[PDB]
Amino acid sequence: RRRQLIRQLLERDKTPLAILFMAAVVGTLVGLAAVAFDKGVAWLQNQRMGALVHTADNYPLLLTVAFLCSAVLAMFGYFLVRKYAPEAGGSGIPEIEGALEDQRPVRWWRVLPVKFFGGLGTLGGGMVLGREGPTVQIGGNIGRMVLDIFRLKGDEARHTLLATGAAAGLAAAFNAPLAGILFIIEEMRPQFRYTLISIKAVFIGVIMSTIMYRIFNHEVALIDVGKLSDAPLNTLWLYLILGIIFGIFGPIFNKWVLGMQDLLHRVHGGNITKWVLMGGAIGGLCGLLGFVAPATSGGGFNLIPIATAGNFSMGMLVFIFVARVITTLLCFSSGAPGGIFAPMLALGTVLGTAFGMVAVELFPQYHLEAGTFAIAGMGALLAASIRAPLTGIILVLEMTDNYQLILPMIITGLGATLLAQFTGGKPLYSAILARTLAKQEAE
Amino acid sequence: RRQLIRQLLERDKTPLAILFMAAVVGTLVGLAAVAFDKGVAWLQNQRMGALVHTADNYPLLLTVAFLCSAVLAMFGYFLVRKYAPEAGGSGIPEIEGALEDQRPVRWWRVLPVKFFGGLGTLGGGMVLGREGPTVQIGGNIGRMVLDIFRLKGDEARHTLLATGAAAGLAAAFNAPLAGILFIIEEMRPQFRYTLISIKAVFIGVIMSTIMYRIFNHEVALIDVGKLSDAPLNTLWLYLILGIIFGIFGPIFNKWVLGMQDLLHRVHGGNITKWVLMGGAIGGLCGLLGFVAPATSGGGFNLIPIATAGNFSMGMLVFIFVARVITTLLCFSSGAPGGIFAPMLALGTVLGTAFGMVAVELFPQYHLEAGTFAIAGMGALLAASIRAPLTGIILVLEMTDNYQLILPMIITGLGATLLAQFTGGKPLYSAILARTLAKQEA
Known part of the structure; x- marks a missing residue:
């Protein structure tokens, strides 16, 4: 297999131009999608805040509309999942992980609105959950979506675009591009066999996605902690x-x-x-x-x-x-x-x-x-x-x-x-x- | 599929024997990298002091500059050509080949050849980097303890050979992350599956870096300060x-x-x-x-x-x-x-x-x-x-x-x-x- 390798080595890193371009498209969409989701969750948490002020005197009444507002929003989230896309519940990362092993379906026509609006309720209600759940699974489905739309063929395209979508989803959820790409190649990708996930293309998606986040969320870090002291x-x-x-x-x-x-x-x-x-x-x-x-x-x-x-x-x-x-x-x-x-x-x-x-x-x-x-x-x-x-x-x-x-x-x-x-x-x-x-x- | 369900539940269970040895490899690659670094610095220092010994006769001083590095270079090229030809050049492709099981890791030969051969080319002040020596050395150090403790399996051979190369890049730049990232982006077998335990590569990269920190702290290789932001x-x-x-x-x-x-x-x-x-x-x-x-x-x-x-x-x-x-x-x-x-x-x-x-x-x-x-x-x-x-x-x-x-x-x-x-x-x-x-x- 020395002769195969010499051929393979010289043909290393030549990702199809059609895959690279579409990776840039997926990234941008997953970017805008993640920003929109982030703006939505913020708005709802803000309305609930404003409602508690509308009744900021009657403490037992105020303790109620706090409950109910998040209760109603939660129910709307659970329902959207159960009724239209049961696979869009929970984290969503295991599901995209399964989709890479070709063992789970990426029903983008259903999960995209279910996850986006369903998570918008659970998160917007102020439940103890993270943004990456929605964004990663959404991002993966966005990746699958443009695959079907542009009808790209091959395992490489299917595995790649599904990966750059999940990566661009984690990166736009934290403003953490490196952590996004590193997540695909340490946890997301098929762990027990070989795969054709172009890393260069995963990058392009993560970039565009992060750039989208930067256009709408600059100047204010999610976590500011300052420069701490060193460690002897x-x-x-x-x-x-x-x-x-x-x-x-x-x-x-x-x-x-x-x-x-x-x-x-x-x-x-x-x-x-x-x-x-x-x-x-x-x-x-x-x-x-x-x-x-x-x-x-x-x-x-x-x-x-x-x-x-x-x-x-x-x-x-x-x-x-x-x-x-x-x-x-x-x-x-x-x-x-x-x-x-x-x-x-x-x-x-x-x-x-x-x-x-x-x-x-x-x-x-x-x-x-x-x-x-x-x-x-x-x-x-x-x-x-x-x-x-x-x-x-x-x-x-x-x-x-x-x-x-x-x-x-x-x-x-x-x-x-x-x-x-x-x-x-x-x-x-x-x-x-x-x-x-x-x-x-x-x- | 039922295979996958089996594989998932058995994910990340790297054999403790492999983990322990990875800690050992890193430590050795660490100290080896430190010692190499101290050596190169010493020789560049001697040449510096020799130019001071003759800091008046400009034509003479231009000569002992040439010769000192010339002689040191010659000693480097010779040690490679005579005892370990595979230890010339970068050395990274050589370890890369070793991971594909298509090149041999002659550690008994390359270890002293590369360490002292590189000590001459580097110490002579040639335009070359420390990672060449340290990565190749690190891989052979990793191969060395595999043989010595007689660990069996492709996983052990592939892992220990990788943690050694990673711990060698890390101890060359004080860059632990770039070390681990190098194995999983460039070094490891690129066209097929492999059994390189990432957790184990880490442990080697840590202990190696720790060794570097013990002997080289307080002084960064590159200080550039905090630059401006980018609109x-x-x-x-x-x-x-x-x-x-x-x-x-x-x-x-x-x-x-x-x-x-x-x-x-x-x-x-x-x-x-x-x-x-x-x-x-x-x-x-x-x-x-x-x-x-x-x-x-x-x-x-x-x-x-x-x-x-x-x-x-x-x-x-x-x-x-x-x-x-x-x-x-x-x-x-x-x-x-x-x-x-x-x-x-x-x-x-x-x-x-x-x-x-x-x-x-x-x-x-x-x-x-x-x-x-x-x-x-x-x-x-x-x-x-x-x-x-x-x-x-x-x-x-x-x-x-x-x-x-x-x-x-x-x-x-x-x-x-x-x-x-x-x-x-x-x-x-x-x-x-x-x-x-x-x-x-």
Whole structure:
């Protein structure tokens, strides 16, 4: 096979011009789509805010229209999914992951409006879910859409355009282009065999998508954390210890989301009415908690700078962590459309800060800043539960811009993945696609 | 399908034996990289002090400059030709071949040959990079412990050989991310499936970097400061720059390939004609490394100076031309040493050139030429080696100007696109092919 290789080597990186151009098209659309979605969620959270002021005196009445507004919006989200596109519930990343293995269908004519408006409700209602869930699955379907429209033929085009769509979706959700491309080549793409996903083309989509986001969302970062302090060599062992903590909690959190999928499935049994009602109950709880304790509900991007800056007490940190574990599980294991990335960044930050605080008092000779352990533990739950550390690290790096902490971020993130494996944990996205694939045969 | 459902549930369960050994490989590749780095620095230092010993007789001083680097070069070419011919040139294509199981990893030979052979060419101040030695060494270090502990399996052989190459790039630039990204974008078997545990490559890259940090902290290879931001209406200039790199990339690619040929006629394959030609080239660098140091050496020294715009346009053009010459002469001669570093310097200079023109044509954009230098810095890496995602993350890790990520990506991709469309080829893959085809003919 030496003679095949010599031929192959000389023919390396010559992606078909038709694929490159369409990748630029997919990226732009996924970009505009993600911006539109982001503008929609913001508007709804804003109306709900304005409604609570309309009745800002009668506290029991105000606690109600908080609930109902998010309850109604939640129900509308669960319903759009159950009735028109059941595959558009939950994260959406496992579904696009399956579509790359050619084992799941990309029904773009249905999921595009279902996910966009269904997620618009769950997110707009202030449930503990992330934007990447919608944007990635939408992005993947946008990729499939132009494939069918322009009738491009081949596995390369199908696999590529479906990949650049998912990548341009994650990148436009975080303003993180590198994390988007890195997600495709570490987690998304077919993991157990070869594939023809042109990386150069995945880039072009991610660029155009990011450029679209930059045109409509510039000047205001999702997470501003400032330039933190550096990390001395003799302080590194503290980050490994932190990673080991995430490493044994990761798999545990993984079981809970899986098990809570089951327990919540008994409440409705599969019935479209019991489910939608259960959704509004959960959704209504979040919009309520999003007024009496806003750190326990919502995406989580708001309490990240606050936690890093050490403006929370240890009592508040413990409270927020427990309360968010609950509302994260309740929201993601319910089947509502929405990703789990963003609330796992928040969970990781809080826990990291908690470790950072104890680290500060036990070791004043290290001159520690608890905000360094928050950034280190920020993409750690992504590492111990999702088991894609290289993506989670570059994601955090792209959002916090604290490169002088790259070693603690890596050391913690890897201690997470090591202990997640060694304690019998499984990739949450892959352990879901298997649960979905195996039930498609169980029945 | 039921196979997939089985595979999914068994995803990321890298054997603990492979993980532990990866930590060992990285540590060794780390220390080895550190020691190599300390060696090269020492020799460049001695030559410096010897020029002071005779800092009056200008003709005499121009000589002991030549000779010191000339002799050191000769010792380098000889160590390669006599004991490990595969340890000449970059060394990256060689490890790349090893991953395809199409080249042998003779670690018992290459380790001392490359370490000391590179110690001469680099220490002589030739236009070569540290990653050549460190990556190839790192791969063989990885192969070494595989053999020593007698680990069995393709996974172990493929992984340990990869973590070693990654941990060698990482310990050469203090760039852990670019190290891991290099394996999964360029190094690993590109046309079929493989069993390279990414988690294990990480562990090696960490421990290697940690070793580098223990002996080289507080002083960055490239300090450039925090540059200005890049407005949205300024992005088209970066695509234009990438287009320029995109057409020069393939051209430079032909020249390095062609100069390999022409320099092979001078010695014909003879070990003596070669080594003597080596000291001629190597002696030129140590000479040029005194009368115009910007035209010789790795290049990391003129990078901050160029970005800060402390060069004139006249000097910039000179430096670019004079470095195209001394880069080809050094890498196409077969001397041990990587071509990454001198391509970063080539990309920086061309970028600053484009930046300066941009500044005067567009005062309404309020431009800083140092932004185009950082954009163009990993552009030659993109248009010639054709690994843009690694080149971008490499520059990012070394310059720490993340607020320029869009220009860096737009330029880097405008390089790879035009490199393809103008019939260019991956220089590292266009070499492994040249080497594999002379093997079956």
